[PDB]
Design a protein around this ligand. Structure first.
Ligand SMILES: [Cl-]
Ligand SMILES: [Cl-]
Lengths: 300, 305
């Protein structure tokens, strides 16, 4: 078949008539019907319900239609992307901490891909310290993390203040405050599961920092390997855990998330680049972030 | 006898029923009638003509009733009167951490004082944790500190972000950077003097928080008793220290204060009050803070009114 067949079919489904679609396609109705008849026989499948006056699709017709608008949209994308390629083949390398996979970062990267069709993008999971060294050595070009950096060779900027939340078993008394929220102070005597167990500093450093900023130091603490351990163990009755809000991407039976009322019970997200960085590719990454944030209704 | 006896008797006389009086006093019938009996047997006279409904007094009981209600009334007046002659002098109690003595706090208090000449102002040196408990128990009315509070019964408000500075001996290599400043990262392998040694959390807890916020954990740390010890030992060649910028009120020979380039190398100042605080005395304290800040060229903290 040809793209003509797909375009002819889609117009008929959208206009809901053989003659009405012919007007927008600028052709006569007899040959338009033949093409669709030729498409159906070439497929050996009935796509349109015959013979409806306001034409309706069959089960396979509806399926083929949704596929077709997507395939024809890909052609449009192909053409548009080809005309905006960078002549010199570039690679951009991005470091990130694992917790960022649960929020906006992936769709930011995906959007970034589309802005530079021929750009090779390499993604590396690394902590903040590793990010700092990699940047200075030029092994990454941007790092996304949750900790501030002290280093004259690095420029870090606050992107957003994500809220912290408490993961609890549904039967925990604190789950009564699911819609109201609680204070860090309410958590002082709980069994608290910190994570990950990876090289420090990491997210568990931050959580304990947050308690410490409020004059608090929990003593019933257990460090577990990764987020899923923390949440799985909470779901199994082992205690509670503090998580970034986006970790709600994980929902488990009898696991519940409770908001925190302390204004500074937060986990900031930063972008780190080299101090003297001015690559258009990195400015473009910043704008992609801004684009996504705007769609989400963020400032900040 | 006790006042209880009088209240029980008065109730039976006034209701003319042991049941109606029992339901008025929120007690069972038996104790009511036994207690009156104890009174009657103690005084040696019959006060009530029991057996007859409605319940009425003897001649003796009728007289006793009149003295009893007056006596009970007199007791209530005694208590009310005693509450009246209790001190009319208003006292405001203010908690603060010692490091704030080097900055704007004393002049804020002095100005506050001038605004309220008949007010007793009491000042107590205490840490954020003790402040929090003192506020909840009403032992202070406002607390000034350098740490956030997590307690639903307390409201804390950021007043200003004070810069941290590095205190060094004048011959330290870091002091070659006095004009430009240095980074927290530059201090990681130095001998750092933390203070004070008073109950945690305190200023040393905050300094190490600042480091930890920036992924740093200095290992050459020595806790000393007080700020002057820290600065004195620096001046003596024992290491370096991190101080609030206002601590520059203390100047020692060959002691040099070096700026930090990290934007978040700061030590915030907070006022803490009870969650539902609305006393004009405290609003006035708060306005005094804003007036002093405006005079100093500091950004004013947000409006109360
Ligand atoms: Cl996010
Ligand atoms: Cl000050």
């Amino acid at each position: 078949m040809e793209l003509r067949h797909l375009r002819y079919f889609v117009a008929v489904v959208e206009e809901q008539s053989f003659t009405k679609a012919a007007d927008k396609l600028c052709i006569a109705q007899p040959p338009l019907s033949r093409q669709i008849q030729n498409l159906e026989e070439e497929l050996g499948i009935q796509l349109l319900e015959r013979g409806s006056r306001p034409v309706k699709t069959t089960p396979e017709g509806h399926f083929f239609y949704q596929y077709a608008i997507k395939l024809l949209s890909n052609v449009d994308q192909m053409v548009s992307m080809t005309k905006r390629i960078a002549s010199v083949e570039k690679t951009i390398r991005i470091g990130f901490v694992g917790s960022l996979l649960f929020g906006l970062l992936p769709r930011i990267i995906h959007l970034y891909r589309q802005a530079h069709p021929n750009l090779r993008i390499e993604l590396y999971e690394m902590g903040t310290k590793a990010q700092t060294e990699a940047l200075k050595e030029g092994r990454i070009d941007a790092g996304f993390g949750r900790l501030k950096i002290s280093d004259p060779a690095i420029k870090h900027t606050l992107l957003r203040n994500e809220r912290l939340m408490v993961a609890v078993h549904a039967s925990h008394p604190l789950n009564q405050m699911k819609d109201k929220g609680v204070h860090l102070n309410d958590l002082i005597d709980e069994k608290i599961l910190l994570y990950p167990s990876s090289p420090k500093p990491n997210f568990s450093t931050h959580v304990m920092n947050i308690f410490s900023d409020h004059g608090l130091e929990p003593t019933k603490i257990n460090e577990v390997r990764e987020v899923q351990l923390a949440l799985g163990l909470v779901a199994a009755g082992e205690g509670i855990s503090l998580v970034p809000a986006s970790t709600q991407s994980i929902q488990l039976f009898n696991l519940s998330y409770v908001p925190l009322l302390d204004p500074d019970a937060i986990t900031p997200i930063y972008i780190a680049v080299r101090n003297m960085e001015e690559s258009t590719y990195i400015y473009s990454l910043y704008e992609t972030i801004r684009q996504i944030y705007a769609y989400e209704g963020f400032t900040e």
